[PDB]
Design a protein around this ligand. Structure first.
Ligand SMILES: [Mg+2]
Ligand SMILES: [Zn+2]
Lengths: 204, 80, 128, 60, 113, 145, 99
RNA sequence: AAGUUGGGCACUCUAAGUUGACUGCCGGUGACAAACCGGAGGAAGGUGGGGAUGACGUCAAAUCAUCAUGCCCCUUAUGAUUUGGGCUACACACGUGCUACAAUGGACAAUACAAAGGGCAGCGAAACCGCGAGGUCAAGCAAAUCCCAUAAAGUUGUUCUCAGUUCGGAUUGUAGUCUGCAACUCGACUACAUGAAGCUGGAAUCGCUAGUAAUCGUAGAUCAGCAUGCUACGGUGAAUACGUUC
RNA sequence: AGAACCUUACCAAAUCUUGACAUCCUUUGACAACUCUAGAGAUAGAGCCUUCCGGACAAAGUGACAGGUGGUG
């Protein structure tokens, strides 16, 4: 019933995460990118990987990993980043160059917030307290608005429901607004709990 | 296949099985799943147990049955 | 020379129209207007701007028109003729505007909507 | 889709006409686009994520 | 009267010749061109030599009762051999692989609710 | 459930006769957008009536519409009678003219229309009968006004 | 004696900036450039059933639009060729050179 | 022969950037307000026309068969391979459409005017062969270049003359083409013949307020082949809205 | 947004049980397109025979384990 805000804004005020062109091997390139992304996600779960951009030119693959914990991904001696490079080169015959981008305020990143609240739910925290503290810190860090939602068998109840909290302005119908959206899933003993977070850090 | 430029279709295994024991007059029944095989004049006087889906219906080949498929004589659906 | 050039549009039809001092003959795509157009009402509509401006038969018209159908091209030619007359004499602006000929008819074919047979027509509904 | 079915689609077919396309992301046999090798559902999901170069919502 | 069948007197020859079983529009035109005769001339305003030539051309086309007998013999042969088409002819159902759940009236007769 | 009355369309005069009524009659006759077919039909009918009457085609047409235009109608509510608007008069006249013309037995639509307009001018047409029935039922229900 | 450069990109912004970059590089190297010429854009529309199951009447329509730019170099020079072949464009745009 | 080439970027067009429309100005109704109506100017006037965008909530509405997933269930089978047959059946009832019942038409010959898409082992030009669907050779084209691809309705001439017909094309016989290892069940199309009902449809019921309805074709996704479905495109182009009683 | 085979989830018949598919563990390769025979095939029997860098990779056996378009929206 609600359009995915990222989907609505892609190509208007939000750039694609896949930056390249093709005419013949579009499908093969696309699915190569998909498997690269799946491998990065499976391997950097602990790292606060906000998102990943992929470009390709001159038979090279440029990966840009925007993360909130760049030290963990790089490694003290570059060992981790070199290992990741090597594994990506093993997966794809082409040559991969990886860059890491630091996110200063992880509490204003929708994906990071969604993953944090989902982890807390898996740890069996309070589905209300988690959202309240999330929104509180996001609002104190200058966010113009934030909305959190958690749906599923909240407290283990047989009947699944959803509850959400909001603060400030989140104008989802404004196409100008650069609204950051993320969805995550907690795999609780009772099943899948879906957490959604919308963040509006203001005009930029 | 159907086009004249291509010869009437028939499974090579079915054709060779029919050709086998051609000289002997004690011709037997030939089990076949090839409902799609065309009926050649070589088949006249033969008995083909053609699979219709669950059982092999016996079919006796005559001259008037030349040019048709073996499946046309082993109906698949049952009604009344 | 003394060419008065102008463009006219209607639906998907564009007519480049050039007016020259002449006897009233209209050529369209190197063909006579009364042969190109399948009805004389279209010719009368083409001449309508000339009647409004009171310069009927004082110009020969050369038309390069493509796009649309015959009605669309005829009205595009009329629009081009009105624009050319404007270019030739600004004093005809009032007469042409009152006649309603300087307006580029903005009506176009509405897209088809998904879930509908046409732009508006919807599938036949049946309760139960 | 069934893993055995995906495997049977990947494997070579003795016929050549016996080849059919499956969505390479989930395995749905129906409604698979050739340009992306994706079913409509995966295409929509990835277009929303912005991970299909140059693909955005259309309107006119 | 050609091939033992009367043809409309006031109808053009090309159209009127279609009333002969086995003669349609294409064969009517072909016959009329083989036996030189005006296309628009009505059969009533026709010459005996033209009629004789038309009969001569028609007699060998294998039309009317012979055509009917040949078609019936084919249908009876496919019924007798016990073919699928023969079974469907016996049961009065579509033979050329139509769907009988709906829209089979021309083979199944009127609706029997 | 309606805010009010919407603006009404205005049609251009007939290119040759310069008559709004003629334009709207052409539109009424037109089916599936075949404006050319409608134009040729109307013009042939006008020529036929001019020939058969020795009188102006526009004159006889205007007399036929005046004859077949009603003044009273009835709307279900029992049917209550009510006066007809001036534009409704022309609409109904043209609609009935075309309908009964199409219902005539002549071979071609041009002949049907010509005969029907002639009968309406003589006051002995199907459209005239329609108008007469409408007036009769309006008078019968005059009380409910 | 002309050289054609065809650029194609999903973003008209990036394609315009790359076209300006290559035109500037050619004019610096010294050659004369006629363009850029915007060829008609090619728009491919994809209509998807929005719902996972049934609900045919609800659809979503995506597009991929590729914009096309043409550049003509008239008076080529070795410097121009070297600069064009050494120039690096954004990963998004695809460049084809016909000498 | 051709915008075919020599030449030009005028025009059109293409596509980036910009200007434009905001009840802005004027006059009436209105409580000097909002607003409504009319007018000037303008290509466009009253959210100019459409699209996307779908709040808080409702129906334990749909989906465990796109995907994921708690719990339960089978594991020598509820898993797996192959050939063949179902999903295409057929005394019947319903929804959605295609084709018609004809003269605002059928047939024949000539001749115009669109838009939007697709093309790599894919679009297959011209030529030759066959009446035909199609076959052989084969140019160009990874695209504003070449092809798909001659739009149809229309216009102009001849014929039919109100007839179940020169309407209509279901039905089936025979003989072909094309794809596919393979058209029996169970593809499409083509030639010849056959030529059913149907002569504007009871109760009832549906869409639509303008480039809309209605008609005419055109293209694409899937796809070896198979569209009356779906999604888009344009050609021609209406009628009516008094009113809120139901 | 494409049921003759495939799709296909259903049925008949002919067949397999670490399995059509994935990871680990032991051995180690020349595995396998290709030609022969029997079969409707899936598959089985002998050859031919071609690859491979401290190891990618690929075959055989065993045990974990796989598998389900099965149910509950
Ligand atoms: Mg809005
Ligand atoms: Zn998918």
């Amino acid at each position: 019933q609600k359009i995915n805000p990222i989907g609505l804004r892609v190509g208007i005020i939000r750039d694609w995460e896949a930056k390249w062109y093709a005419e013949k091997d579009f499908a093969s390139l696309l699915h190569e990118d998909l498997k690269i992304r799946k491998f990065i996600d499976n391997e950097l779960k602990e790292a606060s990987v906000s998102h990943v951009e992929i470009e390709r030119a001159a038979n090279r693959i440029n990966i840009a990993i925007h993360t909130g914990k760049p030290g963990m991904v790089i490694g003290k001696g570059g060992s981790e980043i070199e290992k990741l490079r090597n594994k990506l080169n093993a997966l794809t015959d082409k040559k991969v160059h990886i860059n890491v981008i630091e996110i200063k305020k992880v509490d204003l990143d929708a994906r990071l917030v969604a993953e944090n609240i989902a982890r807390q739910l898996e740890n069996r925290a309070s589905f209300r307290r988690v959202q309240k503290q999330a929104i509180t810190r996001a609002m104190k860090l200058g966010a113009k608005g934030i909305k959190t939602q958690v749906s599923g068998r909240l407290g283990g109840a047989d009947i699944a429901r959803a509850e959400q909290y909001s603060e400030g302005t989140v104008p989802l119908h404004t196409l100008r607004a650069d609204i950051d959206y993320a969805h995550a899933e907690a795999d609780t003993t009772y099943g899948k709990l879906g957490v959604k977070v919308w963040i509006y850090r203001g005009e930029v | 296949a159907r086009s004249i430029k291509k010869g009437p279709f028939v499974d090579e295994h079915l054709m060779k099985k029919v050709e086998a024991q051609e000289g002997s007059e004690k011709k037997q029944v030939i089990k076949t799943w090839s409902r799609r095989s065309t009926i050649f004049p070589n088949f006249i006087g033969h008995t083909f147990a053609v699979y219709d889906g669950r059982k092999h219906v016996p079919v006796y080949v005559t001259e008037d049955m030349v040019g048709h498929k073996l499946g046309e004589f082993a109906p698949t659906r049952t009604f009344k | 020379q003394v060419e008065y050039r102008g463009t006219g549009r209607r639906k998907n039809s564009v007519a480049r129209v050039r007016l020259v001092p002449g006897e009233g003959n209209i050529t369209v795509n190197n063909r006579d207007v009364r042969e190109y157009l399948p009805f004389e009402s279209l010719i009368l509509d083409l001449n309508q701007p000339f009647d409004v401006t009171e310069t009927k038969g004082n110009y020969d018209v050369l038309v390069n028109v493509h796009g649309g159908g015959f009605t669309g091209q005829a009205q595009a030619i009329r629009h081009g003729i009105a624009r050319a007359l404007l270019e030739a004499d600004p004093e005809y602006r009032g007469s042409l505007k009152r006649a309603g000929l300087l307006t580029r008819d903005p009506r176009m074919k509405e897209r088809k909507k998904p879930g509908l047979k046409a732009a508006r027509r919807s599938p036949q509904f049946s309760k139960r | 889709a069934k893993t055995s079915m995906v495997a049977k689609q990947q494997k070579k077919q003795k016929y050549a006409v016996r080849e059919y396309t499956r969505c390479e992301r989930c395995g749905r046999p129906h409604s698979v686009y050739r340009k992306f090798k994706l079913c409509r559902i995966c295409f929509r999901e990835l277009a929303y994520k912005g991970q299909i170069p140059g693909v955005r919502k259309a309107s006119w | 009267r050609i091939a033992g069948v009367d043809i409309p007197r006031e109808k053009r020859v090309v159209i009127s010749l279609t009333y002969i079983y086995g003669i349609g529009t294409s064969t009517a035109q072909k016959i009329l061109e083989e036996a030189n005769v005006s296309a628009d001339t009505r059969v009533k305003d026709l010459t005996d030599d033209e009629l004789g030539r038309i009969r001569e051309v028609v007699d060998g086309y294998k039309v009317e009762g012979d055509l009917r007998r040949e078609t019936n013999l084919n249908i009876k042969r496919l019924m007798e051999i016990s073919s699928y088409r023969g079974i469907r002819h016996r049961r009065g159902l579509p033979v050329r692989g139509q769907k009988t759940k709906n829209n089979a009236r021309t083979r199944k007769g009127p609706v029997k609710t | 459930p309606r805010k009010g009355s919407v603006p009404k369309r205005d049609v251009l005069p007939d290119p040759i006769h310069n008559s709004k009524l003629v334009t709207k009659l052409i539109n009424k006759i037109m089916l599936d957008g075949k404006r050319g077919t409608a134009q040729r039909i109307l013009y042939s009918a006008f020529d036929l009536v001019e020939q058969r009457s020795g009188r102006d085609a526009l004159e006889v047409f205007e007399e036929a519409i005046n004859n077949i235009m009603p003044v009273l109608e009835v709307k279900a509510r029992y049917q209550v009678p009510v006066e007809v608007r001036p534009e409704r008069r022309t609409t109904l006249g043209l609609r009935w003219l075309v309908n009964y013309a199409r219902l005539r037995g002549e071979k071609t639509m041009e002949d049907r229309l010509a005969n029907e307009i002639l009968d309406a001018a003589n006051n002995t047409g199907g459209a005239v009968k329609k108008r007469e029935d409408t007036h009769k039922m309006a008078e019968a229900n005059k009380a409910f006004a | 004696q002309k050289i054609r450069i065809r650029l194609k990109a999903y973003d008209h912004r990036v394609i315009d900036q790359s076209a300006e970059k290559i035109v500037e590089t050619a004019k610096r190297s010294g050659a004369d450039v006629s363009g850029p010429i915007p060829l008609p854009t090619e728009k491919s529309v994809y209509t998807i059933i929005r719902a996972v199951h049934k609900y045919k009447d609800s659809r979503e329509q995506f597009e991929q639009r590729t914009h096309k730019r043409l550049i003509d170099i008239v008076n080529p020079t070795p410097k121009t060729v070297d600069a064009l072949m050494g120039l690096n464009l954004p990963s998004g745009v695809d460049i084809e050179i016909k000498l």
